[PDB]
Amino acid sequence: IETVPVKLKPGMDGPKVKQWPLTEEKIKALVEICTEMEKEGKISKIGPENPYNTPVFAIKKSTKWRKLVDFRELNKRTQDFWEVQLGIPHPAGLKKKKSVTVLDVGDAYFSVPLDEDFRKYTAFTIPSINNETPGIRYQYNVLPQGWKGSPAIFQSSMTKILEPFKKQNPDIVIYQYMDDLYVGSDLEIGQHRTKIEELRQHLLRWGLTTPYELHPDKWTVQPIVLPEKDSWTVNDIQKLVGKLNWASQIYPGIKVRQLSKLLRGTKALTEVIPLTEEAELELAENREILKEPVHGVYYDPSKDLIAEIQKQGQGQWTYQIYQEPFKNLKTGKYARMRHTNDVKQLTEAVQKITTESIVIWGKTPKFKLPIQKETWETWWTEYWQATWIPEWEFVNTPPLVKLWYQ
Amino acid sequence: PISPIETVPVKLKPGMDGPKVKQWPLTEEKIKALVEICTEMEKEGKISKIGPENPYNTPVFAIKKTKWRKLVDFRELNKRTQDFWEVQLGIPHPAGLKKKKSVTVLDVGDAYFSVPLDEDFRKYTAFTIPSINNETPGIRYQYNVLPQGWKGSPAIFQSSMTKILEPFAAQNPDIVIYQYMDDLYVGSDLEIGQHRTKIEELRQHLLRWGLTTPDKKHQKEPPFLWMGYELHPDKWTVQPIVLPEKDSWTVNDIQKLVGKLNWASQIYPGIKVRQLSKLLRGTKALTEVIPLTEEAELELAENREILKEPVHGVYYDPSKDLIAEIQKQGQGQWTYQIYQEPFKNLKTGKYARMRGAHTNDVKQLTEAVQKITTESIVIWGKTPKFKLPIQKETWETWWTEYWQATWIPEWEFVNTPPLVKLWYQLEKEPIVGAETFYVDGAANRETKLGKAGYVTNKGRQKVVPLTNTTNQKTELQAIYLALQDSGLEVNIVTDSQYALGIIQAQPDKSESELVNQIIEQLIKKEKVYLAWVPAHKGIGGNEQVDKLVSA
Ligand SMILES: N#Cc1ccc2c(Oc3ccccc3OCCC(=O)N3CCCC3)cccc2c1
């Protein structure tokens, strides 16, 4: 075929990102994968005159190793190409559907040549152990998985392949994000699953090979809960007054004047204090104010999404997504049954939040992760199954906001 | 010397052109020396004489010791040539080298001059040999090979060397060739006879591609003085470390001292540099003489004791397991060994912390395991099994309650004190029968004076005055007051998010004297519960302590 030209945003040099060291098992898997890819023409060896680098990792999505390339930096430096010049629009109705299946279509990108003058920016290195040898250096000849230019260029062909199917099934929504197809319907599950298999067979018989069920009608901002107790002590009222004080940053219509009166005087922490009727009415009225949702929180497509995560113990994690503090677009809680650890749980939660985020808004959030950076940089691939990678940073402040979001 | 290797293409950076740097005069004794050198290099194809059409020129100098050597200043050309894939910025570590029966060291001579230089790029290497007192035009010459001191040479030579070795490596798949600048290191487990043969055959292969290699009579012999190391047929250690004795200590001298110690710590167990590096926090000037603290004097004297002893490390066998053991080695300092069979250490190291003002032992131990896990992957491509002086209940209690996510790997308890322990543990629920102190502190931001007070539920009240303090430090001093004046169980109620955060993190060591005092108190207490209420909301107890301390 013919290759569409590509250009970095002017005044930008290609990516020069350092390759992380790898386990010998992960390196052995990469060498075997790249040997075959080279035998099939998809990549080629490169010389010292290419100074570019983009990190590479080995994961499992299945007992077969797969190769994952971190094109975050290259993506940030091509974004004229895939955001504006060749944007793929996001449909607002996908979140409303009752079932959504994700289909991996990345393998189809490898049938399309890449602009000969852009290949150099895709360079990558398989490292060696203990600096024994300089790494093995390659670049791409075809459209790579993970580069946001790949779906942008393949967009025309994808529209042609899918056009039959959208004629047949007009109430089915299909959105593309990087290497994935999100397919949503209002059908019964069994009907939905066979409609998905039909589309699989359609994609396959046209040469596009493919190898996750979501229900976006359950997702919502979770409203705050106050304890319901039989015997309240002074400490319990202080926690309750503190939690309600915090909530007034969000819901303007809450007061505790009647509730603090029950603590007037300097009392022992363990003293049982009964709830007067006006106090009990003030608390019950506040439980209604908490049920209703907030107003004035609008997604601003120009601004970055931000996800905060806090560890609650017993396999439970809470999270909020926002663009301005206290303006939570979405709040939620994740749980992990039994055979788990902290990093496995955080990694899984990060992937669920990123998926929800793609469905709702079509962009990935930027995470604030409660973990030491080097611990994350070492273990995150052991449980990572997606093909994309969000941005992240590491927050070393543990606010008491843990108790409040519980 | 000359070679049929293929050439790597080279560009100048986009929109730049070649260097035109005028040539300074010479003593005309060197101008004779350069002529003899350039005519030799010409006869071997290294350079060629060029016409007047070439407009570029890079300065050329000359310098003697016995013999002379030509020196070229490519700084202008270097700034103008494209970037390259940087050659390996690290070196292999002896604790990672796999043991091998016989090992040979080959240096390749005139390595750069043996590799050809891309044709279109040759004009931008032009240099000029001066005629005495400008009495005639000078000699124009350009390079045909990789020039010494140019930006591309280390990388183009390395990639060239890799390709040249490739056919030989295919035919002898059981011999190991590390490559490192102009050196090759070759090992095998063949009979020292056949090993000496295969070496001679690889010399011949290299000579066919134009790479001279040393004779058996000239190949270096063990022990090997390599990159600050000493390699022996079965063991390795560092080269001798001489710490200076000096009455005044300059910042530059302290930097040179921490570095030397850092180097020794990879095999000399026990090294410490925490107090010595605290001095260096005054990076202001390099000559400014920093007055050595008394903790630093103790540290340095202990290092000198250990350096007096000699020590060594061993080589790696991938069939035997990999084990890491860690010991507490001071206040916030830690030391570790890595080995496969006991007392036969591959290497050692240390871990101190600049993590934050306050920490505790369990967190620091976890941070140390992390540092080792990173190091082991780099050196051996795997994680060790860990031997640690902490019990499962100590660590499980910490990591379940800790707000951050941590991964604790395969480890086993070792009963060698000091053990890692939680010195105290805050209560989770308020305490019945214990006096409830309501604390608050305050300070005037201008006058920098303030007061810490409490009010309890048994009717006791107290205010203590504070000079040259801050609002944050007084909120801590109020907490400290309540521990002092309480019995063995106490409930405390504070308005201060700052102070709550710092204590809820259960630190056991701090940069702050005040926090260290609180820590002394929290240990002696049987039970402590700490609770927070929002300030200035008239809760009950906070209002009174606030009124008492505030006005
Ligand atoms: N000057 C220098 C220099 C020499 C040799 C190096 C060296 O040797 C080897 C070369 C090829 C394969 C294995 C090798 O190591 C085997 C370990 C072993 O048993 N040894 C006894 C003395 C040297 C190490 C390795 C790395 C750097 C060396 C650097």
Instruction: Write the DSSP string, B389-432.
Output: SB-HHHHHHHHHH-SSB----SEEE---SSPB-------SS--T
Residues 6+ apart with CB under 8 A from B387: B323, B324, B325, B326, B411, B412, B414
Helices (H) and strands (E) in chain B, counts: 13, 23
Q: Check: CB of residue B460 under 8 Å from CB of residue B474.
A: no
Q: Check: CB of residue B325 under 8 Å from CB of residue B349.
A: no
Return the domain boundaries, chain A.
5-92+118-158, 93-117+159-213, 214-299, 300-405
Strand partners, B453: B440, B463
First to last CA, chain A: 55
Which chain B residues are Cβ-neighbours of A132 within 8 angstroms? 92, 178
- Give residue for tokens 């997606």: A386
Q: What are phi and psi of A63, to 5 degrees?
A: -95, 5
| 3 state SS of B244 | coil
Amino acid at B184: L
- Give residue for tokens 């101190």: B352
Q: Is the CB of B235 under 6 A from ligand 1?
A: no
Instruction: Please give the distance of CA B134 from its chain centroid, rounded to a whole number.
Output: 52
Q: Which ranges in A206-276 belong to alpha helices (H)?
A: 234-247, 257-260
Query: What is the rounded CA–CA span in Å between residue B172 and residue B185?
Result: 15
Instruction: Kindly give the pairing relationship between strand B489-494 and strand B436-443.
Output: parallel
- Pair of tokens at residue A313: 């113990």
> A199-208 b/e with 16+ CB inside 10 Å = b?
bbeebeeeeb
Distance B497 CA to ligand 1 centre (A): 58
Count of positions (residues) in chain A? 406
Nearest-10 Cα torsion for B153, B159, B163, B165 = 80
Q: Check: CB of residue A82 under 8 Å from CB of residue A405.
A: no
Which residues belong to CATH 3.30.70.270 in chain B?
A: 94-109+155-224, 236-308, 323-413
Domain B94-109+155-224 has CATH 2.130.10.10: no
Return the closest-CA partner of residue A104 out of A210, A198, A213. Answer: A210
Q: Which long-range contacts (CB under 8 A, 24 or more apart) does A255-261 make?
A: A255/A282, A255/A286, A256/A282, A256/B537, A257/A282, A258/A282, A259/A283, A260/B537, A260/B538, A260/B539, A260/B540
Q: Is the CB of B224 under 6 A from ligand 1?
A: yes
Query: What is the rounded CA–CA span in Å between residue A254 and residue A244?
Result: 8
Residue B407: which of A265, A311, A375 has the nearest Cβ? A375
CATH number for the domain whose boundaries are A300-405: 3.30.70.270
- A283, exposed or middle or buried, with CB in 10 Å at 0-12, 13-18, 19+? buried
The CATH class that applies to domain A214-299 reads: alpha beta
Domain B30-87+112-154 has CATH 3.90.1300.10: no
Chain A contact probe: residue of B539, B543, B547 with most A CBs at under 10 A = B539
Q: Check: CB of residue B493 under 8 Å from CB of residue B456.
A: no
Q: Check: CB of residue B38 under 8 Å from CB of residue B31.
A: no
Distance B187 CA to ligand 1 centre (A): 7
Q: Check: CB of residue A196 under 8 Å from CB of residue A172.
A: no
Amino acid at A265: G
DSSP state letter for B540: S
Question: Which secondary-structure segment (H or E) carries B532?
Answer: strand B527-532
Which residues belong to CATH 3.30.420.10 in chain B?
A: 436-549
DSSP per-residue letters across B21-33 = -PPPP--SSHHHH
Mind telling me how many Å the CA of B371 is from chain A's nearest CA?
A: 8
Alpha carbon separation from A171 to A98, A159, A180, B5 (Å, rounded): 12, 17, 20, 64
Instruction: Kindly give the pairing relationship between strand B411-413 and strand B436-443.
Output: unpaired
Query: What is the rounded CA–CA span in Å between residue B284 and residue B281?
Result: 8
> Hey, what CATH topology would domain B236-308 get?
Alpha-Beta Plaits (3.30.70)
- Give residue for tokens 């290299």: B206
Q: Check: CB of residue B339 under 8 Å from CB of residue B317.
A: no
Amino acid at A337: M
Q: What are phi and psi of B63, to 5 degrees?
A: -165, 140
A5-92+118-158 matches A93-117+159-213 in fold? no
B253 is in an annotated binding site: no
- Pair of tokens at residue B514: 């005040």
- Give residue for tokens 């000096």: B246
Closest A-chain CA to B493: A269
Q: Check: CB of residue B533 under 8 Å from CB of residue B539.
A: yes
**Residues of B (152-171) whose Cβ lies below 8 Å from A:** 152, 155-156, 158-159, 162
Question: Which secondary-structure segment (H or E) carries B362?
Answer: helix B361-380
Query: What is the rounded CA–CA span in Å between residue B338 and residue B226?
Result: 22
- Known binding-site residues of A for Mg(2+) equal 104, 179-180
- Pair of tokens at residue B458: 């048994």
What is the architecture, at CATH level 2, of domain A5-92+118-158?
Roll (3.10)
∠ CA(B145), CA(B151), CA(B153), 5° rounding? 35
Alpha carbon separation from B222 to B91, B96, B104 (Å, rounded): 19, 18, 9
Residues 6+ apart with CB under 8 A from A193: A101
Which residues belong to CATH 3.10.10.10 in chain B?
A: 30-87+112-154
Q: Check: CB of residue A309 under 8 Å from CB of residue A369.
A: yes
| 3 state SS of B281 | coil
Q: Check: CB of residue B184 under 8 Å from CB of residue B109.
A: no
Omega within 30 of 0 (cis) for the link into B154: no
Q: Is the CB of B313 under 6 A from ligand 1?
A: no
- Give residue for tokens 């190769």: A67
Residues 6+ apart with CB under 8 A from A285: none
Residues 6+ apart with CB under 8 A from B169: B177
Query: What is the rounded CA–CA span in Å between residue A392 and residue A368?
Result: 6
- Pair of tokens at residue A305: 């999404």
Nearest-10 Cα torsion for A261, A266, A269, A271 = -70
- Give residue for tokens 């009124």: B547
Residue B544: which of A132, A266, A342 has the nearest Cβ? A266
- Give residue for tokens 């010049």: A85
Residue B311: how many CA atoms within 13 Å on its side-chain side?
22
| 3 state SS of A299 | coil
Q: Check: CB of residue B176 under 8 Å from CB of residue B187.
A: yes
Query: What is the rounded CA–CA span in Å between residue B454 and residue B440?
Result: 6
Instruction: Kindly give the pairing relationship between strand B527-532 and strand A66-69.
Output: unpaired
Residue A375: how many CA atoms within 13 Å on its side-chain side?
21
Closest A-chain CA to B382: A23
Which CATH superfamily hosts domain A93-117+159-213? Answer: Reverse transcriptase/Diguanylate cyclase domain (3.30.70.270)
Q: Rg (Cα) of chain A, in Å, rounded?
A: 26
What is the architecture, at CATH level 2, of domain B436-549?
2-Layer Sandwich (3.30)
> B465-504 b/e with 16+ CB inside 10 Å = b?
ebeebeeebbbbbbbbbbbeebeebbbbbbbbeebbebbe
- Give residue for tokens 């395969």: B410
CB A342 to CB B406 under 8 A?
yes
- B8, exposed or middle or buried, with CB in 10 Å at 0-12, 13-18, 19+? buried
Provide the angle, in degrees to the nearest 10, between the axes of the packed helices B294-308 and B251-264: 40
A390 Rama sector, left if φ>0, alpha if ψ -120 to 50, beta otherwise: beta
Closest B-chain CA to A313: B400
Return the closest-CA partner of residue B482 out of B438, B442, B428. Answer: B438
Q: Rg (Cα) of chain B, in Å, rounded?
A: 34
Residues 6+ apart with CB under 8 A from A40: none
CATH number for the domain whose boundaries are B323-413: 3.30.70.270
DSSP state letter for A366: E
Instruction: Kindly report the number of other CB atoms within 10 A of residue A237's CB atom.
Output: 24
**Residues of B (111-150) whose Cβ lies below 8 Å from A:** none
Residue with CA nearest ligand 1 atom 19: B99
**Residues of B (84-103) whose Cβ lies below 8 Å from A:** 84-88, 90-93, 96-97
- Give residue for tokens 């250690």: B237
Return the closest-CA partner of residue A321 out of A397, A405, A388, A225. Answer: A405
- Known binding-site residues of A equal 104, 179-180
Alpha carbon separation from A187 to A80, A359, B326 (Å, rounded): 38, 18, 59
Q: Is the CB of B314 under 6 A from ligand 1?
A: no
Query: What is the rounded CA–CA span in Å between residue A197 and residue A199?
Result: 5
**Residues of B (433-462) whose Cβ lies below 8 Å from A:** 433, 435-436, 438, 455-457
Q: Is the CB of B105 under 6 A from ligand 1?
A: yes
Tell whether B7 is within 8 A of chain A (Cβ).
no
CB A134 to CB B87 under 8 A?
yes
- Expressed in Å, this structure's resolution amounts to 2.5
Instruction: Kindly give the pairing relationship between strand A366-369 and strand A392-394.
Output: parallel
